[PDB]
Design an enzyme around this catalytic site. Structure first.
Site, PDB file in Angstrom:
ATOM      1  N   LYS A 263      -0.424 -12.866  -7.914  1.00 45.30           N
ATOM      2  CA  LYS A 263       0.628 -12.943  -7.095  1.00 45.30           C
ATOM      3  C   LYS A 263       0.162 -12.246  -5.837  1.00 45.30           C
ATOM      4  O   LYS A 263       0.704 -12.750  -4.660  1.00 45.30           O
ATOM      5  CB  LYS A 263       1.701 -12.216  -7.828  1.00 45.30           C
ATOM      6  CG  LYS A 263       1.912 -12.450  -9.169  1.00 45.30           C
ATOM      7  CD  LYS A 263       2.150 -14.104  -9.444  1.00 45.30           C
ATOM      8  CE  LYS A 263       2.715 -14.365 -10.623  1.00 45.30           C
ATOM      9  NZ  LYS A 263       1.833 -13.439 -11.898  1.00 45.30           N
TER      10      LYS A 263
ATOM     11  N   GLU B 169       8.515  -5.049  -7.554  1.00 46.26           N
ATOM     12  CA  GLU B 169       7.047  -4.975  -7.285  1.00 46.26           C
ATOM     13  C   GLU B 169       6.802  -3.333  -7.030  1.00 46.26           C
ATOM     14  O   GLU B 169       7.419  -2.514  -6.678  1.00 46.26           O
ATOM     15  CB  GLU B 169       6.607  -5.859  -6.298  1.00 46.26           C
ATOM     16  CG  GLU B 169       6.752  -5.177  -4.923  1.00 46.26           C
ATOM     17  CD  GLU B 169       6.107  -6.158  -3.866  1.00 46.26           C
ATOM     18  OE1 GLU B 169       5.375  -7.242  -4.490  1.00 46.26           O
ATOM     19  OE2 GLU B 169       6.383  -6.249  -2.834  1.00 46.26           O
ATOM     20  N   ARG B 170       5.640  -3.173  -7.388  1.00 44.32           N
ATOM     21  CA  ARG B 170       4.857  -1.836  -7.412  1.00 44.32           C
ATOM     22  C   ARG B 170       5.081  -1.279  -5.940  1.00 44.32           C
ATOM     23  O   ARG B 170       4.895  -2.025  -4.963  1.00 44.32           O
ATOM     24  CB  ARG B 170       3.641  -1.828  -7.761  1.00 44.32           C
ATOM     25  CG  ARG B 170       2.552  -2.988  -7.155  1.00 44.32           C
ATOM     26  CD  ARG B 170       1.136  -2.934  -7.781  1.00 44.32           C
ATOM     27  NE  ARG B 170       0.885  -3.114  -9.360  1.00 44.32           N
ATOM     28  CZ  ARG B 170       0.740  -4.511  -9.635  1.00 44.32           C
ATOM     29  NH1 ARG B 170       0.437  -5.304  -8.803  1.00 44.32           N
ATOM     30  NH2 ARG B 170       0.488  -4.364 -10.973  1.00 44.32           N
TER      31      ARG B 170
HETATM   32  N1  LIG Z   1     -10.403 -15.087  -4.507  1.00 43.28           N
HETATM   33  C1  LIG Z   1     -10.423 -13.852  -5.292  1.00 43.28           C
HETATM   34  N2  LIG Z   1     -11.532 -13.350  -5.573  1.00 43.28           N
HETATM   35  C2  LIG Z   1     -11.585 -12.216  -6.109  1.00 43.28           C
HETATM   36  N3  LIG Z   1     -10.464 -11.505  -6.920  1.00 43.28           N
HETATM   37  C3  LIG Z   1      -9.404 -12.062  -6.560  1.00 43.28           C
HETATM   38  C4  LIG Z   1      -9.015 -13.183  -5.802  1.00 43.28           C
HETATM   39  N4  LIG Z   1      -7.959 -13.540  -6.028  1.00 43.28           N
HETATM   40  C5  LIG Z   1      -7.322 -12.464  -6.577  1.00 43.28           C
HETATM   41  N5  LIG Z   1      -7.902 -11.666  -6.973  1.00 43.28           N
HETATM   42  C6  LIG Z   1      -7.624 -10.442  -7.767  1.00 43.28           C
HETATM   43  O1  LIG Z   1      -6.503 -10.482  -8.437  1.00 43.28           O
HETATM   44  C7  LIG Z   1      -5.711  -9.274  -8.436  1.00 43.28           C
HETATM   45  C8  LIG Z   1      -4.341  -9.764  -8.242  1.00 43.28           C
HETATM   46  O2  LIG Z   1      -3.191  -8.949  -8.936  1.00 43.28           O
HETATM   47  P1  LIG Z   1      -1.723  -9.260  -8.567  1.00 43.28           P
HETATM   48  O3  LIG Z   1      -1.739 -10.757  -8.166  1.00 43.28           O
HETATM   49  O4  LIG Z   1      -0.971  -8.279  -7.865  1.00 43.28           O
HETATM   50  O5  LIG Z   1      -1.102  -9.190 -10.066  1.00 43.28           O
HETATM   51  P2  LIG Z   1       0.461  -9.118 -10.435  1.00 43.28           P
HETATM   52  O6  LIG Z   1       1.169  -9.523  -9.480  1.00 43.28           O
HETATM   53  O7  LIG Z   1       0.801  -9.720 -11.751  1.00 43.28           O
HETATM   54  O8  LIG Z   1       0.557  -7.605 -10.515  1.00 43.28           O
HETATM   55  C9  LIG Z   1      -6.136  -8.606  -7.175  1.00 43.28           C
HETATM   56  O9  LIG Z   1      -6.563  -7.280  -7.673  1.00 43.28           O
HETATM   57  C10 LIG Z   1      -7.388  -9.250  -6.618  1.00 43.28           C
HETATM   58  O10 LIG Z   1      -8.529  -8.404  -7.072  1.00 43.28           O
HETATM   59 MG   LIG Z   2       1.616  -8.898  -7.161  1.00 43.96          MG
END
Ligand SMILES: Nc1ncnc2c1ncn2[C@@H]1O[C@H](COP(=O)(O)OP(=O)(O)O)[C@@H](O)[C@H]1O
Ligand SMILES: [Mg+2]
Ligand SMILES: Nc1ncnc2c1ncn2[C@@H]1O[C@H](COP(=O)(O)OP(=O)(O)OP(=O)(O)O)[C@@H](O)[C@H]1O
Ligand SMILES: Nc1ncnc2c1ncn2[C@@H]1O[C@H](COP(=O)(O)OP(=O)(O)OP(=O)(O)O)[C@@H](O)[C@H]1O
Ligand SMILES: [Mg+2]
Ligand SMILES: [Mg+2]
Lengths: 464, 186, 97, 503, 50, 395, 238
Positions: A159, A185-186
């Site tokens: 996200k 969100e956080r």
């Molecule tokens: N292209 C990418 N390459 C490596 N890691 C990724 C990539 N896209 C997203 N991530 C990882 O996915 C995580 C996304 O967390 P987030 O979307 O905030 O989850 P939520 O919104 O459910 O809390 C990030 O910490 C990031 O490290």
């Molecule tokens: Mg997020």
């Protein structure tokens, strides 16, 4: 003359008023808490009338310290948020209090957060495509300039990365004025965003409203309305075009459920409030591009337990023009941004809008990936070798198409160190047409991960 | 052809816009004229007289009515017993009976278990009458006990019946000034 | 009555006491509202009309208010007459095409 | 006139329990009680006034609800739900109420802090840009934890979660011995639903390692009522926050946070609130977020303090897609999934290098480790997939075989024994041995010994390696050359358990 | 198709401006009638020839 | 061109016609209000499902009549409601305006306009709960409703008086199919013969406003709005409109039907009606049945769909053809509401995303889809050339 | 409409096979003349067609009398049946009762008992053998469940009324063929969500001698009348 508290159950508070002075619904009331360092003025929002001059209210602040019998005064109006061109550049909360400058905005024009959606006669559908520079989005789920876009997914699948990436793709260059509603969100992400928008110098052209997780559900549900009011002010009065980011809108319905269980209303299905669809609709229909003006909205939707059938996502699906759907499985494959090509959808992916060359390629890619997803049940047991040649030739390039949909986003630079990539639409169409026709079937799959365009594909393949 | 149809549509919409504007200004100006006419009681009383004539023209009464049947019948039997007592009573004895009934009401609301037991209607009420008498004969005037000697459906109504009888007695004492009491109560 | 209110509201209690007083008098009571107090002859005529709209004779209590700029409104039991001219202005405003 | 008559008419409180059942009570009186006020009952028992109705007050009983009965007097404490706090808690084991359970003595509390105090807002916070060294090679190398970070330790039953968090707590002693509060991290270990023997074992391990000089334990053992399990995280965070706002650095471990969810489920269902998914009430999210958002790094305008959280979550049969796991994954800034399928084979700590992520990333990693190790994550992931492939390859190219052996030796490098935290100055060397390929001549079965011996070699002689790393947090060439010289010198003196030398 | 669409757009715009002018002409006349219609309506409301 | 005479005459006709009955009527007072529900005291003479009239012009339906209170669902903006204010009775069981002047309009479920093109010259009012035509009044479906879709007209025909459920998952072609079916009727409408031209009603339940507008202008593009009506209960509107829209659509249809016309009704989509009825029933605190749905969720759809049929020649021969839409979460057909509607309707067009994504469009799963009136709703030639295509494709 | 079922003393089992000319039925699910026969099926698999075919095949040759109960079925097929029976001569001897789904729970509950009262008259007071058809007898307990929560009964399992078993038995036990006077019952049963485990089918299964269980899985393969050869069963297959 004023009222008194008579019941308290969490953030929900019942107040009794004189016989003839009962406040209307959604009116704001003030009450005092005077214990100590916990002391504060509580804002309550009227949610129900219980009869006998008694009304039930939702507290926008934690009720800890509120004793029975304290007086409660009616403001006579709904919760009001500041609006105006001076709103841009600063951070606000649900009650219109500026966090960067406490006194800021007290002297601005104030609008009620509760408003009726625009008349049907003033609605018009949008069809102009928005080019984001992400291969999977621009190919299979073309966004709409002035429409409603959403990103679905479970926990820990992208996200925030993709949302700040889209901020870089649109807001970094959008000529208009942006609003960012952080709905449950956080907070750390909010601080990171407040810093980043200043580093990129975009802050001066965008307003931020935050309602992060720590806040009780009552304000956690009204934050969205608070920001939407500023967005629709910039829409209707200034006449500017607007970007309205919201993350995460599922927490709005979750706070609705929390407050519902306290209001005493019977539970629905798995445990959400009744009128779930009615609250979500009253929220979403206000976010629309009326005739002659536009408000482009990108929303994030959480999905608990990856249960895409949960009533809340299933309800919010109805209000969206573009729906990118993330998946756990694609994330495990190492694909990023991990969009599910077969579940995601866009209403403007039709030849009359995007053209024949785009549509034919998108549908051929979908066909290949669908055949692949149908053969998966055998692939998992007997491997690729059991398949007949018409299926094996297809699967070999299906894997490559799937992996090529990945992209090295700008936001990920802070984790992988690899720089970001933007690709134009025509180059993506060319690349996927070539792929479906097999002009790249001789390269290994690992060559396709996280490339970008075609020249970068060749550069990477040369190194392997 | 569809374009020409839209031409006709816009013409109709223009007609509607002018029509609604005319009507809105008409009704607003009519409100102004009405409020200008209504500025002195010579108009108020005349308007009330016109309404009175219109109501005289209105169809005659058509509704006889203008907590339940068993409780209602018990209340009517209490009313008849009071009719007998008052036929015997006088204003001073009436006030004495009223005070006795207020005291017995306070007693009944204090001893909730007695009301919960007694309020159940049944045949053979005589032993209930003796239970009532054992206490009613000590702290209540003979007339209050005689009326109390009287079927209600619920304890709340049975208790309210005592207040009802007391009100009847004190109002009859007033009658022995009905208009004065009514006006002061209003 | 105050000594045994047992949960009812004071205003409704006293109003019910008055309604009982008038019923025991053999009449009924209607609440009337108008912008100005009617004359004695007017009140006798109003009673003569209500005595034809309802069987047992109806007494009246007048709640003067300038809202009903003209005419008067009558409430009895749970039936009402909307005779005021202000209701006519509201009707003409809402009935407009 | 009416006002004066109203005033004339208007012209230490104690209540009574009317109803009591299964950890909840209803109280009459107390017109002036505050919501969530800490009531007290005759039996030396406390309660939290959750619901205030028009006629009675609903109080959740904390502790032994057995001692409560109808007709008991209840009296106010005059304090909103709060715990005592101060520096005096360092080295004590306390129950959620701040009362000592170790029998070691009374608590010289400084002040009292409410539990429901709101987290610091967006404008008060600062970026996580400061390293919380855990001492586990498999974590500090690939998934660094920054101060102010929330790192989930989600895993399966019997997978070394508590062990990992105890190692993280023990590693901070090397810093505690310095008097400067900027390095002087202090810790809190909140035990929810753990067995009493396990809490005693943790207490013992921390004492033996010297960690009890700076660690506070909050014990809500499985035997106590649901209310203690429900409060334990909040009282732990309350103990931490007082240090945090004073400019200290705090480390909070929650072991384990799913049982607080279960305790709140119990409490909610006893109050007859309608449950939602997985029978949990609709507000478990506001439980875990209300708890974990307290953790932050404060801006220097508010004191440069911080509080770091390591919540543990137990997963049913590694189904990371369950309700509570996904809720906490949506709150914390990362997770280090401990897979059981690796734990039983011997990969310990069993960090799943594929699913584990640090969503703050390399921002909180020291430059030395950032350079030496930053390649390791993807290399190990591709090694794991290469192994999954080659498991049935009758023959394969030499390059794949070499990558496979390198991966196997890196995996053997990463593991380390319990209660053996390695300083970063040693972790960087331990990972240098592997990433730069100096292990390419040692047999797998000896690698773990080899490293553990070399760190003592460099410890007795050529200390300028560890000192040069520590004093600049970057590995300079003038030290790397001496490191390589020492490695090559040691290779000749080292010998395997069987076979030839290691070149 | 394009030719017919252009002709339709031209018809729409010319009718738009013509209708604007015609409405401007007629509403001025309506302004005079409105007062007498209002007097009639007030006479209906009160029940007398106000 | 515009003339002063018409405007002046309309204004003067209203002004001179204005009169008030001054009628005595019963009064009640609101004792509770919230979430679109209101509890009103008084109103002893109130009928079940009577239209209550609240003081802000808002209406309500009295569903529950308790011993001491009336439970009403507010059909409109509930924000303006306040405890203690006055409520009137309308003297009218739940009814909606009907008339052929509705062609081309967009109307609130209560039968008042939202397209902005002004008031509707309604012909009469019809109750929303009139009984369906009995076994004796109906006639056998024997004439086709030309959809112009090969996969339907040949394989699973739809006849006049037939109910054909369109049951799919998100983005599978439900609205596409129904809009195409409405568009194809122009070639018959232009004949001017009432015995073959088909009048249409598109009931939008829970649709977002821009989707309703896109449907509207897609119909205008094809000339369908010359004979199509739209009942719009958009997402924003209270659960009452969302629950009621299908019934007012059915009433607008039944008027033409019983007047001897042929009507087509599309419900898009009835799962939103089930959700709205669930919401309303839960706010009224009825104990729910399975899956939190109201106990009588079946009776919500049955009395909605059974009221479309073909009348006998003794009642004008008119008919009404329903095409209800159902949205199935995660593409399982064996669920509660879909299996109810499958048993209420005469045939199934089941749209599967896994076929849509592989070029089979419209994505009719040939196996599950069926039309139980079948080849009786087809022209002879198609019965010859397509008499068995369904079974052959399933095999 | 309401009468207690016949005493156990008067009941005897039936063992005479009824020939219908349907391959699958005559082979794997042989019917019993004078017994209780049922079709089972989810939504849409074609129960209404098969029951009308049984009308066509039995009531044509059957020289006695017959009754058809429309219990919550859709009206169009009832009209098709009324017209079809009048196109042939059978209507002269076939009574029809309809309580179709357009009507509220009360009629859906009591229509079955009314048609059954007519059938019981033909059985007891005349002795002329009779065919009783019921379509669809699930709507009976469905209406019961619809009215339950309003009457004041607490809901049971997946959401039926608690009285389900006895409410359904008080009906089913009346359709029995006492000795010397037969009733041949053919009743169609709806299976919610194709869930053969649902309490309603699970309770109905006990009252039947032969069950021709349709299934969607077979219908999707184009096999028509789509009887499941494995689940379908009959007691006379001895
Ligand atoms: N292209 C990418 N390459 C490596 N890691 C990724 C990539 N896209 C997203 N991530 C990882 O996915 C995580 C996304 O967390 P987030 O979307 O905030 O989850 P939520 O919104 O459910 O809390 C990030 O910490 C990031 O490290
Ligand atoms: Mg997020
Ligand atoms: N570093 C380590 N190396 C090898 N084995 C270990 C290590 N740490 C712990 N273990 C094993 O795990 C056991 C303790 O694990 P631990 O108590 O951390 O599990 P846990 O995740 O806390 O499970 P629970 O929460 O149920 O107590 C030890 O007895 C040992 O067998
Ligand atoms: N027969 C067809 N051939 C090709 N494309 C089609 C066909 N039918 C629909 N589509 C396309 O597929 C998409 C389907 O969207 P559609 O309008 O069917 O939504 P829907 O099924 O009504 O879903 P909802 O009920 O949620 O609105 C549209 O973008 C449309 O252009
Ligand atoms: Mg443990
Ligand atoms: Mg649709």
């Amino acid at each position: 003359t004023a009222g008194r508290v008579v019941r308290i159950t969490g953030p929900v508070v019942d107040v009794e008023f004189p016989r003839g002075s009962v406040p209307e619904l959604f009116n704001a009331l003030h009450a005092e808490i005077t214990f100590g360092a916990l002391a504060k003025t509580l804002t309550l929002e009227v949610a129900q009338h219980l009869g006998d001059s008694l009304v039930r209210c939702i507290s926008m602040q934690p009720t800890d310290g509120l004793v029975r019998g304290v007086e409660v005064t009616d403001t006579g109006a709904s919760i009001s948020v500041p609006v105006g061109d001076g709103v841009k550049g600063h951070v606000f909360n649900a009650l219109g209090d500026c966090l960067d400058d406490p006194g800021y905005g007290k002297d601005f024009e104030h609008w009620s957060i509760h408003r009726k959606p625009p008349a049907f006669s003033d609605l018009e559908p949008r069809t102009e495509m928005l080019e984001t520079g992400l291969k999977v989005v621009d190919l299979l789920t073309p966004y709409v300039r002035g429409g409603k876009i959403a990103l679905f997914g479970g926990a820990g699948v992208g996200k925030t990365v993709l949302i700040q990436e889209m901020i870089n793709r649109i807001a970094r260059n959008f000529g208009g004025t942006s609003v960012f509603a952080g709905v449950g969100e956080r907070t750390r992400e909010g601080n990171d965003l407040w810093v980043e928008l200043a580093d990129a110098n975009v802050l001066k052209d965008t307003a931020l409203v935050f309602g992060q997780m720590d806040e009780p559900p009552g304000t956690r549900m009204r934050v969205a309305l608070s920001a939407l009011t500023m967005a629709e002010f910039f829409r209707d009065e200034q006449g500017q075009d607007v970007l309205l980011f919201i993350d995460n809108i599922f927490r709005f319905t979750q706070a609705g459920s929390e407050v519902s269980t306290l209001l005493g209303r019977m539970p629905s299905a798995v445990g959400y409030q009744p009128t779930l669809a009615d609250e979500m609709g009253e929220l979403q229909e206000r976010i629309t591009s009326t005739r002659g003006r536009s408000i482009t909205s990108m929303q994030a939707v959480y999905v608990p337990a990856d249960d895409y059938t949960d009533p809340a996502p299933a309800t919010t699906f109805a209000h969206l023009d573009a729906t990118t759907e993330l998946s756990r499985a694609v994330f495990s494959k190492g694909i990023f941004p991990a969009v599910d090509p077969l579940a995601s959808s866009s209403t403007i992916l039709d030849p009359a809008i995007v053209g024949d060359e785009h549509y034919r390629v998108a549908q051929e890619v979908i066909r290949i990936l669908q055949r692949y997803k149908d053969l998966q049940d055998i692939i998992a047991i007997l491997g690729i070798d059991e398949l007949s040649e018409e299926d094996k030739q297809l699967v070999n390039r299906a894997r490559r198409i799937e992996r090529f949909l990945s992209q090295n986003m700008m936001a990920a630079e802070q984790f992988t160190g690899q720089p970001g990539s933007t690709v134009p639409l025509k180059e993506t169409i060319e690349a996927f047409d070539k792929l479906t026709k097999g002009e790249f079937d001789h390269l290994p799959e690992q060559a396709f991960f996280l490339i970008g365009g075609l020249d970068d594909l060749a550069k990477k393949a040369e190194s392997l | 052809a569809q374009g020409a149809q839209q031409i006709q549509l816009m013409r109709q919409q223009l007609i509607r816009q002018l029509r609604t504007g005319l009507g809105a200004e008409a009704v607003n100006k009519a409100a102004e004229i009405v409020r200008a006419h209504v500025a002195d009681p010579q108009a108020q009383s005349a308007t009330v007289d016109r309404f009175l004539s219109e109501l005289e023209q209105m169809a005659p009464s058509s509704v006889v009515i203008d907590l339940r049947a068993a409780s209602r019948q018990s209340l009517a039997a209490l009313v008849e017993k009071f009719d007998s007592v008052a036929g015997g009573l006088d204003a001073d004895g009436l006030t004495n009976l009223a005070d006795e009934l207020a005291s017995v009401a306070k007693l009944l609301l204090s001893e909730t278990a007695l009301n919960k037991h007694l309020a159940e209607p049944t045949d053979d009420s005589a032993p209930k009458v003796r239970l009532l008498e054992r206490l009613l004969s000590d702290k209540v005037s003979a007339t209050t006990l005689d009326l109390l000697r009287t079927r209600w459906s619920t304890e709340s109504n049975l208790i309210d019946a005592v207040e009802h009888t007391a009100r009847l007695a004190l109002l009859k004492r007033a009658e022995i000034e009905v208009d004065e009491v009514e006006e002061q109560l209003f | 009555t105050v000594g045994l209110l047992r949960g009812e509201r004071a205003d409704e209690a006293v109003i019910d006491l008055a309604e009982l007083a008038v019923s025991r008098r053999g009449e009924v009571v209607a609440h009337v509202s108008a912008a100005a107090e009617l004359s004695d002859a007017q009140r006798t005529r109003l009673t003569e009309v209500l005595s034809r709209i309802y069987g047992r004779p109806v007494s009246v209590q007048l709640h003067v208010d300038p809202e009903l700029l003209g005419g008067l409104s009558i409430t009895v039991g749970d039936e009402v007459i909307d005779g005021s001219i202000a209701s006519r202005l509201a009707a003409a405003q809402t009935g407009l095409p | 006139x009416x006002x004066x008559x109203x005033x004339x008419x208007x012209x230490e409180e104690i209540g009574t329990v009317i109803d009591a059942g299964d950890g909840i009570a209803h109280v009459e009186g107390l017109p002036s009680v505050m919501t969530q006020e800490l009531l007290e009952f005759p039996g030396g028992v406390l309660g939290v006034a959750l619901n205030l109705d028009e006629h009675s007050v609903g109080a959740v009983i904390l502790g032994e609800f057995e001692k409560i009965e109808e007709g008991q007097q209840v009296k106010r404490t005059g304090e909103v739900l709060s715990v005592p706090v101060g520096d005096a808690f360092l080295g004590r084991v306390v129950n959620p109420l701040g009362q000592p359970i170790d029998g070691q003595g009374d608590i010289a509390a400084e002040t009292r802090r409410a539990l429901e105090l709101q987290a610091p807002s967006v404008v008060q916070r600062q970026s996580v840009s400061e390293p919380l060294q855990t001492g586990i090679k498999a974590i500090d190398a690939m998934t660094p934890i920054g101060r102010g970070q929330r790192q989930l330790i989600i895993g399966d039953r019997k997978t070394g979660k508590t062990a990992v968090c105890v190692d993280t707590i023990l590693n901070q002693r090397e810093a505690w011995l310095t008097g400067d509060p900027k390095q002087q991290v202090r810790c809190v270990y909140v035990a929810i639903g753990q067995k009493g023997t396990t809490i005693a074992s943790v207490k013992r391990a921390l004492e033996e390692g010297g960690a009890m000089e700076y660690t506070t334990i909050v014990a809500a053992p499985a035997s106590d009522a649901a209310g203690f399990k429900w409060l334990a995280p909040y009282t732990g965070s309350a103990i931490g926050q007082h240090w945090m706002y004073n400019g200290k650095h705090v480390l909070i471990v929650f072991d384990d946070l799913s049982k607080q969810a279960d305790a709140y489920r119990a409490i909610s269902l006893l109050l007859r609130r309608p449950p939602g998914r997985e029978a949990f009430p609709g507000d478990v999210f506001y439980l875990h977020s209300r708890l974990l958002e307290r953790c932050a790094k404060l801006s220097d305008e508010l004191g440069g303090g911080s509080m770091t959280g390591l919540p543990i979550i137990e997963t049913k049969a590694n189904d990371i897609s369950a309700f509570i796991p996904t809720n906490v994954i949506s709150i914390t800034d990362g997770q280090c999934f401990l897979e059981s399928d690796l734990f039983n084979q011997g990969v310990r700590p069993a960090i799943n290098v594929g699913v584990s992520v640090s969503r703050v990333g390399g921002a909180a990693q020291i430059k030395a480790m950032k350079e030496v190790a930053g390649s390791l994550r993807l290399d190990l992931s591709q090694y794991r997939e290469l192994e999954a492939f080659a498991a049935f390859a009758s023959d394969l190219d030499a390059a794949s075989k070499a990558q496979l052996d390198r991966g196997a030796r890196l995996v053997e490098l990463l593991k380390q024994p319990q209660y053996s935290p390695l300083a970063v100055e040693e972790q960087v060397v331990a990972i240098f041995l592997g990433t730069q390929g100096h292990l390419d001549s040692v047999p797998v079965e000896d690698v773990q010994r080899f490293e553990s011996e070399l760190l003592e070699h460099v410890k007795a002689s050529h200390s300028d390696i560890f000192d040069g790393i520590r004093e600049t947090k970057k590995l300079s060439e003038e030290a790397e050359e001496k490191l390589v010289s020492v490695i090559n010198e040691f290779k000749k003196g080292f010998q395997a358990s069987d076979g030839s030398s290691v070149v | 198709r394009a030719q017919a669409s252009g002709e339709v757009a031209q018809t729409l715009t010319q009718a738009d401006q013509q209708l604007s002018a015609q409405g401007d002409q007629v509403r001025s006349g309506l302004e005079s009638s409105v007062d007498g219609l209002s007097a009639k309506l007030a006479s209906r409301i009160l029940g007398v020839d106000v | 061109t515009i003339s002063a005479a018409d405007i002046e005459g309309a204004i003067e006709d209203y002004v001179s016609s204005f009169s008030a009955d001054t009628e005595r009527e019963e009064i009640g007072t609101v004792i509770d209000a919230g979430d679109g529900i209101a509890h009103v005291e008084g109103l002893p003479s109130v009928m079940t499902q009577e239209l209550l009239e609240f003081p802000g012009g808002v209406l309500g339906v009295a569903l529950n009549l308790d011993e001491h209170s009336v439970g009403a669902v507010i059909l409109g903006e509930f924000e303006k409601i306040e405890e203690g204010q006055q409520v009137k009775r309308t003297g009218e069981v739940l009814s909606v305006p009907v008339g052929d002047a509705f062609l081309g309009r967009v109307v609130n479920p209560l039968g008042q306009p939202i397209d902005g093109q002004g008031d509707i010259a309604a012909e009469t009012r019809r109750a929303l709960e009139l009984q369906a035509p009995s076994v004796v009044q109906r006639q056998s479906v024997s004439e086709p409703l030309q959809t112009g879709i090969k996969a339907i007209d040949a394989m699973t025909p739809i006849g006049r008086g037939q109910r054909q459920l369109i049951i799919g998952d998100r983005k599978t072609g439900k609205t596409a199919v129904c809009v195409d079916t409405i568009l194809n009727q122009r070639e018959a409408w232009l004949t001017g013969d009432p015995k073959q031209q088909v009048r249409c009603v598109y009931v939008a339940i829970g649709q977002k406003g821009t989707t309703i507008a896109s449907v509207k202008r897609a119909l205008e593009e094809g000339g369908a709005m010359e004979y199509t009506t739209i009942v719009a209960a958009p997402a924003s509107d209270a659960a009452g409109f969302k629950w009621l829209a299908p019934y007012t659509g059915s009433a607008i249809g039944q008027h033409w039907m019983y007047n001897g016309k042929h009507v087509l009704i599309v419900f898009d989509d009835l799962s939103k009606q089930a959700d709205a009825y669930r919401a309303i029933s839960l706010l009224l605190r009825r104990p729910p049945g399975r899956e939190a749905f109201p106990g009588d969720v079946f009776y919500l759809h049955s009395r909605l769909l059974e009221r479309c049929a073909k009348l006998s020649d003794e009642l004008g021969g008119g008919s009404m053809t329903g095409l209800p839409i159902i949205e199935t979460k995660a593409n399982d057909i064996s669920a509660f509401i879909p299996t109810n509607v499958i048993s209420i309707t005469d045939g199934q067009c089941f749209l599967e995303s896994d076929l849509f994504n592989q070029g089979v469009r419209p994505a009719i799963n040939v196996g599950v889809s069926v039309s139980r009136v079948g080849g009786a709703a087809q022209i002879k030639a198609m019965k010859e050339v397509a008499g068995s295509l369904r079974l052959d494709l399933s095999q």
